[PDB]
Design an enzyme around this catalytic site. Sequence first.
Site, PDB file in Angstrom:
ATOM      1  N   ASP F  43       0.834  -1.193   0.000  1.00  0.00           N
ATOM      2  CA  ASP F  43       0.000   0.000   0.000  1.00  0.00           C
ATOM      3  C   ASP F  43       0.877   1.255   0.000  1.00  0.00           C
ATOM      4  O   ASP F  43       2.099   1.187  -0.155  1.00  0.00           O
ATOM      5  CB  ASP F  43      -0.971  -0.029   1.179  1.00  0.00           C
ATOM      6  CG  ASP F  43      -0.297  -0.400   2.479  1.00  0.00           C
ATOM      7  OD1 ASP F  43       0.893  -0.760   2.440  1.00  0.00           O
ATOM      8  OD2 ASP F  43      -0.954  -0.331   3.537  1.00  0.00           O
TER       9      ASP F  43
HETATM   10  C1  LIG Z   1       7.512  14.378  16.178  1.00  0.00           C
HETATM   11  C2  LIG Z   1       6.161  14.022  16.793  1.00  0.00           C
HETATM   12  C3  LIG Z   1       4.991  14.664  16.051  1.00  0.00           C
HETATM   13  C4  LIG Z   1       4.184  13.649  15.245  1.00  0.00           C
HETATM   14  C5  LIG Z   1       2.765  13.453  15.776  1.00  0.00           C
HETATM   15  C6  LIG Z   1       1.804  12.978  14.688  1.00  0.00           C
HETATM   16  C7  LIG Z   1       0.484  12.461  15.258  1.00  0.00           C
HETATM   17  C8  LIG Z   1      -0.436  11.892  14.180  1.00  0.00           C
HETATM   18  C9  LIG Z   1      -0.758  10.413  14.385  1.00  0.00           C
HETATM   19  C10 LIG Z   1      -2.193  10.063  13.994  1.00  0.00           C
HETATM   20  C11 LIG Z   1      -2.596  10.658  12.648  1.00  0.00           C
HETATM   21  C12 LIG Z   1      -3.615   9.796  11.902  1.00  0.00           C
HETATM   22  O1  LIG Z   1      -3.631   8.626  12.075  1.00  0.00           O
HETATM   23  S1  LIG Z   1      -4.799  10.547  10.748  1.00  0.00           S
HETATM   24  C13 LIG Z   1      -5.979   9.270  10.221  1.00  0.00           C
HETATM   25  C14 LIG Z   1      -6.520   9.590   8.831  1.00  0.00           C
HETATM   26  N1  LIG Z   1      -7.389   8.518   8.382  1.00  0.00           N
HETATM   27  C15 LIG Z   1      -8.041   8.596   7.088  1.00  0.00           C
HETATM   28  O2  LIG Z   1      -7.864   9.535   6.391  1.00  0.00           O
HETATM   29  C16 LIG Z   1      -8.952   7.461   6.629  1.00  0.00           C
HETATM   30  C17 LIG Z   1      -9.125   7.232   5.129  1.00  0.00           C
HETATM   31  N2  LIG Z   1      -8.029   6.438   4.601  1.00  0.00           N
HETATM   32  C18 LIG Z   1      -7.086   7.033   3.673  1.00  0.00           C
HETATM   33  O3  LIG Z   1      -7.227   8.163   3.347  1.00  0.00           O
HETATM   34  C19 LIG Z   1      -5.937   6.196   3.108  1.00  0.00           C
HETATM   35  O4  LIG Z   1      -6.204   4.844   3.349  1.00  0.00           O
HETATM   36  C20 LIG Z   1      -4.593   6.549   3.746  1.00  0.00           C
HETATM   37  C21 LIG Z   1      -4.709   6.496   5.267  1.00  0.00           C
HETATM   38  C22 LIG Z   1      -4.131   7.936   3.307  1.00  0.00           C
HETATM   39  C23 LIG Z   1      -3.556   5.533   3.278  1.00  0.00           C
HETATM   40  O5  LIG Z   1      -3.288   5.797   1.930  1.00  0.00           O
HETATM   41  P1  LIG Z   1      -3.054   4.533   0.903  1.00  0.00           P
HETATM   42  O6  LIG Z   1      -3.502   3.257   1.571  1.00  0.00           O
HETATM   43  O7  LIG Z   1      -3.862   4.759  -0.351  1.00  0.00           O
HETATM   44  O8  LIG Z   1      -1.593   4.426   0.542  1.00  0.00           O
END
Ligand SMILES: CCCCCCCCCCCC(=O)SCCNC(=O)CCNC(=O)[C@H](O)C(C)(C)COP(=O)(O)O
Lengths: 111, 104, 220, 458, 67, 88, 124, 62, 128, 175, 178
Positions: F43
């Site tokens: 992925d």
């Molecule tokens: C240095 C310390 C700082 C860092 C802190 C950062 C904290 C953030 C951690 C949590 C953030 C999240 O999880 S944000 C969660 C966001 N979830 C969604 O958007 C659901 C829909 N799914 C999609 O868009 C795709 O499946 C995708 C996920 C793009 C995959 O892409 P591909 O499969 O097509 O490759």
Amino acid sequence: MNPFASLTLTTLTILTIPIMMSNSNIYKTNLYPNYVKTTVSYAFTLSLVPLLMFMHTGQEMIISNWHWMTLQTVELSLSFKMDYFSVMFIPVALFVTWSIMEFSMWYMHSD
Amino acid sequence: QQERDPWYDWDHPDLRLNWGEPIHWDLDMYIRNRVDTSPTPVSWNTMCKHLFGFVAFMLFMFWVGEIYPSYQPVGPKQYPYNDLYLERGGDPTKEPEPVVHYEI
Amino acid sequence: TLCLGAITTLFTALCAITQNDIKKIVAFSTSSQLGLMMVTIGINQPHLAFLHICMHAFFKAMLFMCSGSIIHSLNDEQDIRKMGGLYKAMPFTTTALIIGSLALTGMPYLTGFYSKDLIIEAVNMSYTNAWALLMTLIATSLTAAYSTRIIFFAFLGKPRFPPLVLINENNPLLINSIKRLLIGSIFAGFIISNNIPPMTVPNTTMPLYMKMTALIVTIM
Amino acid sequence: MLKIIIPTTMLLPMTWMSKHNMIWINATVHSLLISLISLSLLNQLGENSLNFSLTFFSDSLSAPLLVLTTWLLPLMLMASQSHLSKETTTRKKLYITMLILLQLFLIMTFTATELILFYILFEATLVPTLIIITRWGNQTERLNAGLYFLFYTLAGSLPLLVALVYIQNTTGSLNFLIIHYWSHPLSNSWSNIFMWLACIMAFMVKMPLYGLHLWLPKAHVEAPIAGSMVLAAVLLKLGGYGMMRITTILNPLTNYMAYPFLMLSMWGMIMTSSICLRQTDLKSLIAYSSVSHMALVIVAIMIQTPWSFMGATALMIAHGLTSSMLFCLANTNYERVHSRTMILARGLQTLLPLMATWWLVASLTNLALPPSINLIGELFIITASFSWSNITIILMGMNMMITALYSLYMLITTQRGKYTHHINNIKPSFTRENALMALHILPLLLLTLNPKMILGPL
Amino acid sequence: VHIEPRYRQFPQLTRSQLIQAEFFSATMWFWILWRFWHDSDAVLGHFPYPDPSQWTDEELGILPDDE
Amino acid sequence: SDAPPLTLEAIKDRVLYVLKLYDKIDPEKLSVNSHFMKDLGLDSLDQVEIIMAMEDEFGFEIPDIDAEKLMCPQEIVDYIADKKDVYE
Amino acid sequence: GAHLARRYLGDASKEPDPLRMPTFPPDYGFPERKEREMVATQQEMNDAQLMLQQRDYCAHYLIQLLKCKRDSFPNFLACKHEQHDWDYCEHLDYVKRMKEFERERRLLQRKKRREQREAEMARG
Amino acid sequence: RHSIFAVTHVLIPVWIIHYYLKYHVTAKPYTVVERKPRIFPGDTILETGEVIPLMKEFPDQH
Amino acid sequence: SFPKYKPSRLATLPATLDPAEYDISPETRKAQAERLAIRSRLKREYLLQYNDPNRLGVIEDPALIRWTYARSANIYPNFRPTPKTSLLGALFGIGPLFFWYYVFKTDRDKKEKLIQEGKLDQTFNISY
Amino acid sequence: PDSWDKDVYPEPPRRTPAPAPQTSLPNPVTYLTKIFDLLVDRPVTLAREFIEQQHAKNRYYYYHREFRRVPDITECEEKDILCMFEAEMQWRRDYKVDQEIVNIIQERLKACQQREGESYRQNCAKELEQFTQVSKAFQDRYSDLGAHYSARKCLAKQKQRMLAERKAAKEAAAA
Amino acid sequence: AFSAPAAYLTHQQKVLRLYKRALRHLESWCVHRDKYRYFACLMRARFDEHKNEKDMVKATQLLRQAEEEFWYGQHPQPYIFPESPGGTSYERYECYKVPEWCLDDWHPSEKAMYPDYFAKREQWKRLRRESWEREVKQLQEETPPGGPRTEALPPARKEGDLPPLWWHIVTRPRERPM
Ligand SMILES: CCCCCCCCCCCC(=O)SCCNC(=O)CCNC(=O)[C@H](O)C(C)(C)COP(=O)(O)O
Ligand SMILES: CCCCCCCCCCCCCCCCC[C@@H](O)O[C@H](CO[C@H](O)CCCCCCCCCCCCCCC)COP(=O)(O)OCC[N+](C)(C)C
Ligand SMILES: CCCCCCCC/C=C/CCCCCCCC(=O)OC[C@H](COP(=O)(O)OCCN)OC(=O)CCCCCCC/C=C/CCCCCCCC
């Protein structure tokens, strides 16, 4: 004539020779950095002698060699102070410059 | 200009400008050799408070340490010939008040 | 002058302890040593300040040259977070950097000892601003702190550089220059101190704990 | 001193009788010979001036100015022949005639013994300059520039004329030696105040004084290269020379009449230096630089001390050479790219290295790097101002910081960075341009070798 | 001296560089030990620092709280 | 002197070397033309990790807009060769 | 330090002021006091050009050390006895200054207590 | 060819400087001023031959 | 949850912290498409001349000419005397002059009064 | 040497101590100075001897120019231009000579400060006093004339000072 | 740097860019390799925890919260590759880059050296001159009537064509010119 003054002046004077040669057929060759480094090493070795004279007898001088210009009551002349600070700092700076130039011969080889 | 994307193919890469696009009135102020307005990790108005607090604290502490100095438990240094009256400026025709030091 | 030097040396030594570029760390170290020189001038000891200039030149230039050797070996990389274990991979550079760090921290009988140790003792035994004295002591602890940072992150541990290893310090120019500066950093203090006329009055009597202040704060 | 005046008048028919393709060669050769002849005026005395006749005399203040004028003529000729190649033969001869007439008027102006003759020649310099600007300038603004150049001058000089004739009805003479020997103090009355203003304002607008300087950016930007050279190098110094001559009859009124002009000079020096930091046109930056340096010269003349007078003389000579060199350097780039915008052509050090060296040396002399005579004049003026009041070191100090900034800014904008990609017509530097830069810069350092020749009569 | 890249292995080392580094570390440590053996007073101090409280009033010249 | 003159064969060898050390890719099943999503079944997050591993291997950064498009080892090798002026 | 803590936190009335010291006559508590003698003449110190701060009561040892250093120039490790003697003289000088400081402290505290006790007796 | 650097870069400049200092600079007063040598007890003067007496019978705190 | 970052003039708001790019509309998408179209048209117009083999000289940029003209020649025709313009002009063109005049006049009056009383320590003051 | 007058530029008798070696080691300074002598001082001496031999074969002289004294500005009528011109030239020459006198005194002061080393504060008292006196006289004569100075302004300054001194003397007499 | 940008970034693109930025800054915090691997696996688990959210509004809210957390917890001094826009060698070799047209101004004595190189240069110039008009015609055909909408350029499609606007891309100076 007490070689202290002549040696102190010659140490500074010989450093300018590669500057005058920077328009000759040594600045266009690959031997110029070694030439400059050798000049600096020779200057350090020469400057070691007035330091020895000072360490022996504490000899110090001022040399006002060239009269540049004189205002009404203020006279401006090219004068060099050859006290403990000058005769101690010159060999240290020359030694460090020699080492750093030899280092730069290797560090900046691709420049 | 520092805030513009550096991975784009600008017509002028150093200025990060494209040919024909409108130029800011204050471009020469923002040429990125100069004033930068880029976002900072720490908020403005928080950097200012910390910097001013540090500077003011150091100034106040230096004043306090000046009016509460540090020294060794000794008396003043003693000099033989009437506090070296002739050495620190001569005046050999005035006969200064004698300065006398005694053994202890 | 004394207060300016004290605040300068403290602030720069405090900035140096968290930096990740090695050149930045060495530059902040240079600024802190200049602040210490200004402190020495502020307590009416100019000849000690000149002696410290002469002593500091040797090991500071050597430390910068060792950093440059590391940078050239690791494909012009300057971040210490990408320098791993160079203690065995770069033996001569490791030796030179260790000797330079020990001289910078005023380790006994090296070049930096004969100026920095006397400067600390003179600051202790003078009628001076107390805050400036405290900042000088804190700064001379932070000096050892950032020296430790450089050594620990650059030479100890496991490699963190890219896998194509081009580490090579076998070049006579580099070796000879660093060796000359290293001989200086070992012996110049003794040689110069024993060959100059005394222009200052020595602090013959002091409490034992204040005689060991520089060593103790460096160790902490 | 007809041995200098007559050869220039002979340059005139020599130019008008020359073969069509030999005008530049002949003019340059004989201009250089005239400069060599004028070099003999530097043999000056310690007590009085060289009184050649009833009409002309040479002092230790005017001799370096004459040498600068005669040396600037060949440089102007060298700088002009590139952009005048398409011109007809008659118009080229007319342009050279304008330059020669300007030199003749300046030479006679700097050596006139009487103040009315000095006034007549100092106004006569207006006509060739105006003709050059309005006939051989490139853009439509030149016409407006010409008007700004003319009336700004005349509105200052018409009162002076009246004052001059009034003085001759009171003392019986305008001969400078008689005026100096028979000097009498000026009382504190309204009539004396207005006489002081009439005697001062023309030279003030010539320097120019801050607030009266708006004509200068227009005239010095819209002019052709030779016009800009002669406007910056020599014509601005007419005001300083005239002020140092005329102040001998204004004491002790100056003691308090100088305050508004001193305040204007110091604050406007700061202001014009600041203006140089945000300038899009490269020529306008050099013009505002000239304004700042001339403000320094005005302060030196107004405080009326021997050190300030020496500093003013040195600064005028040094600025003339440096500003002329800077204008020529900007003109090379303009002729290459046909635009005066500073950020258009960048990274020129990669394409033209020797020209970059010339740029570096010119900008180093602009910021008064020691021991250049620029620095000598600036330091003498600053020391005299410090004696006048210890607070001046603030404003002067600020100026020293700003100048270098904008100076280096100019360099960093034009020579460093990356070259502009679409500009592909940058040809290698010609021998003529390099020779022009060298003939500007070498006399500066040679004068540094012997600074008493530009330090004036004090 | 030719030393070729290694790609994920320990780099090639010549005997001379290790010899030089070891020699100079050893000479620094020898100098430290020798200078401490001969000049210990430079670190530990040379003269005894006195305790003022153990000075009698006879030599300090204070009268017995009467006059 | 400096680093040796990187060649296309060396770049391809290092790219494949990095890819065979990834636990989510079968070494035998991997070829220079295998698609990350179709052939190998990875992925987008795995592709980001692969791009970062390439960046660590070769000591330079690939911008996101360019890194999104690379889908097989051949595209990665071609991008690296184009960036570093490798023609042999 | 303890004197600094005693002065800045405790009763500053009984603590000597380094800038204003001594406040008691040099012959107050002593019956008679020897005058601190000097060995080096002004002319000798002027000829040796010591320093204006090195011309203390230990200047003769410094002059001897300088002469020995000049005589034993290449052997820069031969002037150990003379340097030690000069250091010992400076140490004795510092000890004398410490004795002066302690004398001032004891005199101040005793005088204040005696005056307060006499006033207290007069208050009853 | 071997040691020609020490001749053209040390010997010739030192010859020129020594000539210039010995016969031109020191031909005017106060151009090369040296601070006077230190004099210690027990020394003998080269010019006059005068000796300097010893130092006042050290107390000998042995 | 975490301490908030607030922007200032000299430290602006990051794009990823901008609310406007997290609540979008089809109108915003259309505007972005139009912006990219304008940029692409300008880029094509520039690149056509840039790659022209017969093109020698400087590719004139109307935007640069407009910028320099607006900064230099368009200013006075668009000036109106207003309370803001008049007040700012009077302040920044008159106030500094009188401030410095007062400072220098006071300093020189003090120095002159000291000189009249004969207590200024002018010994060794030869050059002026 | 004999190039300058030794009373205008005096120096002390130059006492220097004799070498007193206390070590069996050789002196590198003596060996290096012997080498410097033999390798530098002799060829330069020979070149100077040749140059002086050439100079002696062509001996010619130049003279110091003498100026007689003309009437001062005090003896000149108000509008008599010629007498004023001669007096002004004489006054300017006197001004230059006074500047050179001050320069000589300052040279003495600087030389004494360098010569005396660590004892300069006491050993340069006489030169400092001479400079103080000369500086006071010069400041009384020429300070504050400004640019455009002349003999008439100097005379006016002297008259003003004389009037102030006479008034002060007469007021102190009445005390 | 090579690809033509789009009008906007999609949600997936923003998520992936945040993922890369977060991993890089976490590596900046976690200097050692094993610790970085541990916390990077934790970060990947945290990222793919909410991978299957069908509600787009909740997805953008989660992305917003993640970006706020990143800005709070970013390394103030993150590691930058030396040639990247913030690196220590970013534009180090730009002063050594000289455009090819400068070779047209060399003196014939300078061109007397390197004859074969200049013959090849003449061949390349002939190719460019012969290809220009066909490039312009292809661009005229392939462009929509309302002007281009992206900065993407077409390839060559004909027998011996060249991709339009190729000269300044192909004749780049170098990455290490001198
Ligand atoms: C240095 C310390 C700082 C860092 C802190 C950062 C904290 C953030 C951690 C949590 C953030 C999240 O999880 S944000 C969660 C966001 N979830 C969604 O958007 C659901 C829909 N799914 C999609 O868009 C795709 O499946 C995708 C996920 C793009 C995959 O892409 P591909 O499969 O097509 O490759
Ligand atoms: C944009 C830049 C242009 C160039 C700048 C030129 C600078 C010119 C400024 C003139 C400086 C001073 C001029 C006259 C000296 C004193 C002026 C007056 O203000 O001082 C007081 C004068 O008192 C009152 O102020 C009366 C004058 C008031 C009327 C003058 C009008 C000024 C208002 C501002 C108008 C702007 C003028 C400039 C137009 C551009 C002093 O009191 P007093 O001792 O009794 O007068 C001395 C003369 N006495 C002895 C003969 C009697
Ligand atoms: C004495 C009177 C003046 C005293 C100074 C007052 C402040 C002067 C203000 C100067 C304004 C100049 C404006 C134009 C300058 C050119 C633009 C410019 O410099 O660009 C900013 C450039 C870019 O910033 P970087 O962090 O390097 O980032 C680059 C990497 N991305 O940075 C700079 O150069 C800024 C320098 C300005 C410094 C101003 C602050 C200094 C104030 C000093 C006061 C302290 C006095 C010390 C007293 C010592 C004790 C006796």
